Write an enzyme that holds these catalytic residues in place. Structure first.
Site, short mmCIF file in Angstrom:
data_model
loop_
_atom_site.label_atom_id
_atom_site.label_comp_id
_atom_site.label_asym_id
_atom_site.label_seq_id
_atom_site.Cartn_x
_atom_site.Cartn_y
_atom_site.Cartn_z
CG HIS A 1 -5.26 -56.58 -8.16
ND1 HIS A 1 -4.92 -56.75 -6.84
CD2 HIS A 1 -6.10 -57.59 -8.47
CE1 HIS A 1 -5.52 -57.84 -6.38
NE2 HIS A 1 -6.24 -58.37 -7.35
CE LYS A 15 -9.21 -59.13 -2.39
NZ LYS A 15 -7.77 -59.05 -2.77
CG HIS A 33 -7.66 -64.30 -10.89
ND1 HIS A 33 -7.98 -65.31 -11.77
CD2 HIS A 33 -8.79 -64.01 -10.21
CE1 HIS A 33 -9.25 -65.62 -11.64
NE2 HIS A 33 -9.77 -64.84 -10.70
CG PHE A 34 -1.68 -59.41 -8.01
CD1 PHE A 34 -1.08 -58.58 -8.95
CD2 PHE A 34 -0.94 -59.85 -6.91
CE1 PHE A 34 0.26 -58.20 -8.80
CE2 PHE A 34 0.40 -59.48 -6.75
CZ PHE A 34 0.99 -58.64 -7.72
CG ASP A 35 -0.69 -66.72 -8.71
OD1 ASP A 35 -1.76 -67.17 -8.32
OD2 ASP A 35 0.34 -67.41 -8.75
CL LIG Z 1 -7.07 -61.20 -7.79
CL LIG Z 2 -3.67 -59.61 -4.00
#
Ligand SMILES: [Cl-]
Ligand SMILES: [Cl-]
Ligand SMILES: [Cl-]
Ligand SMILES: [Cl-]
Ligand SMILES: [Cl-]
Length: 124
Positions: free
Chosen positions: A12, A41, A119-121
């Site tokens: 990210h 992905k 994590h990217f939410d």
């Molecule tokens: Cl993530």
């Molecule tokens: Cl993402």
């Protein structure tokens, strides 16, 4: 393996450019960050801010994550972000992504000591 914090960095973070290159930004970054190794992905977001500014989001606004966990945080300011998503023409091993660049709030889940993004939410 890869730690959770290091995986968040690789998936990210893009502190080297202020904003998505051109329409080909996502094809290039999804490949160079190794997100198209065995499969494409489907969706992935890159944040164009310094690592320190993204890490600092972990002490900004605490908000629920989509899954109900309560360790998410929303950046107080908007950040330059690029969403990368597969197009209909995408088919491993020829992945293809649409690049959508905008200034939005970043929402990340944080964990650990140091308490950093894992994590990217979502972006708003
Ligand atoms: Cl993530
Ligand atoms: Cl993402
Ligand atoms: Cl690490
Ligand atoms: Cl590493
Ligand atoms: Cl890797």
């Amino acid at each position: 393996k890869e730690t959770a914090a290091a995986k968040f960095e690789r998936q990210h973070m893009d502190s080297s450019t202020s904003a998505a290159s051109s329409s080909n930004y996502c094809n290039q970054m999804m490949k160079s960050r190794n997100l198209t190794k065995d499969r494409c992905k489907p969706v992935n977001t890159f944040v164009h801010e310094s690592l320190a500014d993204v890490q600092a989001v972990c002490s900004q606004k605490n908000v629920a994550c989509k899954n109900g966990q309560t360790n998410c945080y929303q950046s107080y300011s908007t950040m330059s972000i690029t969403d990368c998503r597969e197009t209909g023409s995408s088919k491993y091993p020829n992945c293809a992504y649409k690049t959508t660049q905008a200034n939005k709030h970043a929402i990340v889940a944080c964990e650990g000591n140091p308490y950093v993004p894992v994590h990217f939410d979502a972006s708003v």
